[PDB]
Structure formats: C-alpha cells, structure tokens
C-alpha cells in the first residue's frame, strides 16, 4: 500500500547519574538525556 513512512533514530541519549556526594547518600537520581519517559 503506497504511503509515506518516516523513520527516526531509536532513542539514545546518555544516562547521567546525579548524586549528592557519597559523603551524604547512596541515593542517586538518574537522568536519561533527551528521551520521552516511556522507553525506560
């Protein structure tokens, strides 16, 4: 069926890990750079 399909990269973006210094916590936020929060 003739019709116009785009394409697009998958997602990528690097994972970044926020942390307050391990001086303080073992808790870390995570930042998935430039994605939409689904594919997590």
């Amino acid at each position: 069926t003739l019709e116009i399909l785009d394409i697009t990269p998958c997602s990528f973006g690097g994972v970044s890990v926020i942390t307050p210094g391990t001086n303080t916590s073992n808790q870390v936020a995570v930042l998935y750079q430039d994605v939409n929060c689904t594919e997590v």
């Binding site: 990269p9 990528f12 973006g13």
Partner: peptide
Amino acid sequence: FNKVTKFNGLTVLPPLLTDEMI
C-alpha cells in the same frame, strides 16, 4: 533571534541556561 538560526551518537546538549534565563 530572527537572524541567527539526533542521528549518529551525535547529540546536542541543552545549554544549562535557557534564553528566558539569559
């Protein structure tokens, strides 16, 4: 801002300060 004007691992990171900050 009218004058002056995502593929292979190449990214573009967001500038830490958005224009409405600047």
